[PDB]
C-alpha cells in the first residue's frame, strides 16, 4: 500500500515515471500489486489548481526466504526411532507427514516406534 498525507483542497495523483507521465492512480492512498523487487512511485499533490513538487517514495522488498535444510533421505528399521530436525533458525516451523505427523518445532518430537 502507498500513502499520502491529507491536505485540505487537494486532489492527488500518483505516477510511475518521474517527468510526470504514466499516471497510475488519483486516490490518496492507492495500492501496488505484485512487487518482486524495490520500486518507486511519485506523488504530485494539487490544491486550488497548483501542483506541488513531486515527492517520491521507495517500496523496499524483502528477499526470498531460502529453503529449509533437512537430512538427506534416510532409512530406519522397524522398532527404531525417526528423529527429524532442521539446522536453520526461524520464527516459525511447520512440519507435516505420514500418519498425520504434525509439528511446530526446530526439533520435532521423535517417533519412537517406527513402523510401516
Amino acid at each position: 500500500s502507498l500513502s499520502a498525507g491529507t491536505v485540505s483542497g487537494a486532489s492527488y495523483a500518483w505516477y510511475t515515471d518521474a517527468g510526470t507521465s504514466n499516471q497510475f492512480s488519483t486516490l490518496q492512498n492507492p495500492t501496488v500489486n505484485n512487487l518482486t523487487n524495490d520500486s518507486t512511485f511519485y506523488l504530485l499533490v494539487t490544491v486550488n489548481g497548483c501542483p506541488s513538487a513531486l515527492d517520491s517514495t521507495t517500496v523496499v522488498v524483502y528477499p526470498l526466504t531460502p529453503s529449509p535444510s533437512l537430512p538427506a533421505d534416510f532409512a530406519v528399521c522397524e522398532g527404531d526411532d525417526i528423529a527429524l530436525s532442521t539446522s536453520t533458525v526461524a520464527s516459525s516451523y511447520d512440519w507435516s507427514g505420514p500418519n498425520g505427523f504434525t509439528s511446530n518445532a526446530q526439533n520435532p518430537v521423535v517417533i519412537t516406534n517406527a513402523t510401516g
Binding site: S11, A13, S25, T26, L27, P30
Partner: peptide, 22 residues
C-alpha cells in the same frame, strides 16, 4: 461553462473465486 473533473479512480475488490460475488 463548468469544467470536466478527473477520473475518480475505478477499481474492484481483488480477484474473485469462480461462482461468488464481488
Amino acid at each position: 461553462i463548468n469544467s470536466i473533473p478527473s477520473t475518480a479512480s475505478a477499481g474492484n475488490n481483488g480477484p474473485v473465486c469462480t461462482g461468488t460475488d464481488a
